[PDB]
Paper text:
These are produced during sporulation and are remarkably stable in a variety of conditions, but dissolve after ingestion under the high alkaline pH levels characteristic of the larval mosquito midgut. Solubilized protoxins are activated by insect gut proteases enabling binding to gut cell membranes, subsequent oligomerization, and ultimately gut cell lysis leading to larval death. Cry11Aa and Cry11Ba structures maintain the three-domain organization characteristic of Cry δ-endotoxins.
We sought to characterize the conformational changes that ensue pH elevation, preceding dissolution of the crystals in the mosquito larvae gut. In the case of Cry11Ba, 2.65 Å diffraction was preserved up to pH 10.4. Detailed analysis of structural changes at the side chain level was yet prevented by the non-isomorphism of the “pH6.5” and “pH10.4” datasets. A 1 % unit-cell contraction, and hence tighter crystal packing, was observed in the “pH10.4” crystals in comparison to the “pH6.5” crystals. However, because a higher glycerol concentration was used for injection of Cry11Ba crystals at pH 10.4, we cannot exclude that unit cell contraction might be caused by crystal dehydration.
Numbering used by the authors:
A (entry chain B): 17 to 329, 340 to 352, 361 to 655
B (entry chain A): 12 to 329, 341 to 351, 361 to 657
The structure:
């Protein structure tokens, strides 16, 4: 049975899922919002033609991808909630889209739609079914936040006094964080449940959220502004091997996900497998096993080690043939190696890794193949089915594994980005995990630098796509950021910094005025704060000194306007950098770095404020 | 297996002379005073009274017998009387010039002639101290003679018209000082490399003994030659002393020493010792006649990074400890234990003295080890006989590092990967069978205890050695540059990313933050750097550039003096705990690999460049041609 990622039917391409047009429109609306029309166009994508057809298509896709189904009664309930949302949203849309309308009536019909979603939203936080309902709950919160943004920008045009306008801004800032928290509650409940049930199943749920959920939670954090870029750099993970369960979310956060990422800023160079073959004297037993996986990436500052072991329970390969007189008659322990080819595209695209245990138990072998190069064909006398691991518009960035037979709760404080060797010893792994990264990241991982074009209104620099980083820095899984993670700075005495190499493509307008948006989470007050700099061949320019007073949520800091002529960066500048540094932090002052966003000053604008305009404070009870 | 039962002192029967009581110590203590404030027209008179006190060769005779005793090398009797006559010639001519200038009034044209009678007397008699085949003993003598001549030229330069030197005659002396300060240094390293290279192939313990002598008798003065053209600096020596205990190791190349062994001995050059682990194995036979102890590896762990240290030798048992007792009908007792020597946690967290000894007995049945630091016994030999004491100790010195040399393997592998950071500093070997102890002078206790350079407003100059850093970039190596009177330099080789190194600095309570200072950077950049070398200061986000050094390429060490500044301009106060001094550059290829020796913080009021690099009047220096 030719399998596709363990399934008998090939999965739908990521660029063709039902939420793709919604995500493509949000990318356009985040670059330039249509005043008093953004909600009408968003409604046309979430409910096309005033039908729940997209929400039905989203449901059946996620139900097929997760193998989880909603009850028949709950489906007809959601159908009624959809009709209620569609009916009330169309009435408000048709009335404001006239040549002349009474602003007092549009205000009434607005609150009929605004409060229709607030009261019907918990119907999508389905208990015991949040694995499927998280993708539906994601669109309803996008539908309501889009309504609140158009209501703020309309104001008097829709019957909102300056005090009514600030009440909507207060709801926006509350719901942009409440919907995010309620989204992570549905995610953690299901991802935590599946980590203890089946690791391959837990990865499959995270892959679904990386395409149906997390791109839109990032759009929420960008819905405040105009002129940024919606970018998703999350990775997809396929699991091949024996089942692994009873994984806790703490083990994933502080160990397993760190081993899977490997060197988060480097491409794969070669991966090594601890392979052992066993055959009995009657030629009836054939058992192949993978005891360890050693991924070597294209550079530092991360040092990788064995996941599992490289031990033969330095020798490259050892064969053995034994003859007895009435136990192994043939024994082969070999360190296999799959090498990434040196070319203009130094990445693996597809993989054919499969593991099959036969019913009597005598046969159990592995197949390893990347692109068209066969690393291991099973020595089992029978053929092992093909298991194509691939995603369209995705490439293989990392190949790792999960330690088997050991607890994943050890050495969490020492699985850092630098200094310490990124490894986790185990008797065996018997599994191979492949990380697929989207093609939009292929430019950085090929050249180890961020090339900038003057025709782009915004560029997103993920935190994990760095050049160097300080010691005592960790990797934090922040999938709600539409990225593969964040950096957790924990150095106590010396400073905490991280540099990002930048290059200017030929023909770049070095005179255009840019701004830098820094997304970070600093929970405690920092006396010296956080500094943003740029280093080009000795010309160290300070772009901003972020005042840190303490906040539990993510904070976007927008530096003052600047140009690359002020920074001394040209086309031939091969030593340009962006630096984010701070002083030593204690346990409470440990802060996180999400991403850097370079926007044009002409196109960037903060349409929704963090604080109301007229009223002193948001309404309190 | 020697039949002499004596309490040994570093392998010798008699305790060695204290480092501060050696014969060249008064010469070194005067040079440190002259570099802080040079006595015009008297610097050579006072230097002559220390090298030749009372117009006698008594000091040079004491220096000779001390180095000959320490090195166990003896100059030929004929060659001693030769140097005796050469001393008399130098004493006679220098006394005539000194007595004539030290009178009430003297004719300046006469003091000009008697100056070159003494100058050309040293230039002609100097090759008599470059004795071929005896460079081990002669290097201590050749060092003082160059100190005698370089101090003579400096006094003549600053005198000028007082000793009959026209502005053209003054430039002629400046061109000689600039030539001899590099020619004498090159000729000095020729004598050192010939002998330290010979003994590395002969006996490692003997080669370390020679380097210990040069660290006290030679290299303190080569550094004084580099500081001789200034006034207001500090003459500091931070070289370490290395004692060897164990079986003989020979056939070591200078390349094996430069790119491997010396890195293993230093361990973490910016940290103090925390604990040392030894791979110990005991063996006894069923006849209760054989008792063999072995040290198969040494694992030194220091107080921090960024250097990651590993095993020198191995930690394998060929588990912390395993005891075996076997009965047969010929190993009957086998103990494989990883011993540990932990530096105490106190206000002075350093070992002072050690008692490490290894004795192989004549029949071959007994061979054990004794390991003891301070009053804590790490290992008492289980050999039935007592092993003599071997006190490793230098007054005014403390134990900074404890390492070993890999035995049974070549030291020419993995040189490109024995770096300061990233890669684990280790060298696998079947056995070491030796323990090497590193003694650092007490002047470095302040840094290695606090991991920071505390500055006092009462000091006219402070020396920051390159190896006493807080952080350093990747692909940075350790270069053994003993002519800098330090434990080495930093070789920056990172090709793509930048090359930087930070130095943590603190201000003692009562420091005057308004006083003006300057920074002196010594570096050897053989190729031109487009972006050059940048000197900065980082204090809690306040990055101040102190200077951008233009680098165009030079084969020698270059001293760059930044513009004057104050700690008020840098925002550094007494309570500033995150202050740093940065030395960054861009990526360098193979040819552009540069070195960093040290940083010298001097007060602007006390610092002056008294001898220039270029002459004043003449456009170019006169050459040696006809």
């Amino acid at each position: 049975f030719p399998m596709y990622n363990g399934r008998l039917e090939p999965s739908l391409a990521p660029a063709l899922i039902a939420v793709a047009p919604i995500a493509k429109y949000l990318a356009t609306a985040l670059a330039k919002w249509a005043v008093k029309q953004g909600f009408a166009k968003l409604k046309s994508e979430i409910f096309p033609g005033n039908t729940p057809a997209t929400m039905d298509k989203v449901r059946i896709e996620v139900q097929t991808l997760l193998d989880q189904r909603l009850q028949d009664d709950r489906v007809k309930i959601l159908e009624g909630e959809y009709k209620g949302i569609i009916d009330v949203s169309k009435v408000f849309t048709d009335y404001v889209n006239q040549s002349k309308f009474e602003t007092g009536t549009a205000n009434r019909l607005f609150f009929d739609t605004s409060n229709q979603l607030i009261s019907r939203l918990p119907q999508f936080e389905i208990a015991g079914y949040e694995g499927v309902s998280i993708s539906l709950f994601t669109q309803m919160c996008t539908f309501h936040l889009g309504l609140l943004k158009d209501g703020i920008l309309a104001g008097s045009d829709w019957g909102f006094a300056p005090a009514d306008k600030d009440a909507l801004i207060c709801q926006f800032n509350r719901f942009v964080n409440e919907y995010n928290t309620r989204l992570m509650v549905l995610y953690s409940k299901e991802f935590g449940r599946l980590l203890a049930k089946n690791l391959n199943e837990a990865l499959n749920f995270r892959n679904m959220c990386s395409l149906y959920v997390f791109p839109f939670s990032e759009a929420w954090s960008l819905l405040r502004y105009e002129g940024t870029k919606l970018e998703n750099t999350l990775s997809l993970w396929n699991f091949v091997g024996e089942s692994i369960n009873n994984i806790s979310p703490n083990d994933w956060k502080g160990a397993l996900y760190k081993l899977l990422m490997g060197a988060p800023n480097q491409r794969l160079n070669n991966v090594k497998f601890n392979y052992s073959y066993f055959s009995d004297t009657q030629a009836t037993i054939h058992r192949e096993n993978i005891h360890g996986v050693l991924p070597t990436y294209n550079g530092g500052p991360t040092i990788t080690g064995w996941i599992g072991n490289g031990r033969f329970s330095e020798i490259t390969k050892i064969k053995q043939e034994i003859t007895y007189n009435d136990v192994p008659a043939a024994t082969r322990n070999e360190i296999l190696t799959a090498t990434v080819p040196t070319s203009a595209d130094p990445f693996f695209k597809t993989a054919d890794i499969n593991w099959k245990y036969f019913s009597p138990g005598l046969y159990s072998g592995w197949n390893i193949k990347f692109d068209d190069t066969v690393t291991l064909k099973s020595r089992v006398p029978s053929i092992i089915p093909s298991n194509i691991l691939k995603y369209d518009d995705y490439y293989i960035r990392a190949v790792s594994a999960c330690p088997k037979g050991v607890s994943l709760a050890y050495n969490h404080d020492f699985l850092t980005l630098t200094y310490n060797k990124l490894e986790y010893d185990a008797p065996t792994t018997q599994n191979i995990i492949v990380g697929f990264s989207p093609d939009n990241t292929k430019s950085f991982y090929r050249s180890n630098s961020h090339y900038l074009s003057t025709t782009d209104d915004a560029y997103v620099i993920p935190a994990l796509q760095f050049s160097t980083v300080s010691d005592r820095s960790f990797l934090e899984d922040t999938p709600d950021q539409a990225t593969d993670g964040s950096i957790k700075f924990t150095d106590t005495v010396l400073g905490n910094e991280a540099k990002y190499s930048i290059r200017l493509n030929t023909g770049f307008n070095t005179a255009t005025r840019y701004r830098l948006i820094i997304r970070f989470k600093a929970p405690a007050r920092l006396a010296a704060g956080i500094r943003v700099r740029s280093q080009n061949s000795g010309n160290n320019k300070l772009l901003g000194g972020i005042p840190v007073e303490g906040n539990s949520g993510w904070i976007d800091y927008i530096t003052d306007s600047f140009t690359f002529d002020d920074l001394g960066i040209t086309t031939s500048s091969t030593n340009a950098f962006f630096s984010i540094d701070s002083d030593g932090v204690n346990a409470s002052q440990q802060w996180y770095l999400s991403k850097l966003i370079l926007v044009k000053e002409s196109s960037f604008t903060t349409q929704i404020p963090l604080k109301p305009y007229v009223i002193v404070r948001c309404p309190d009870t």
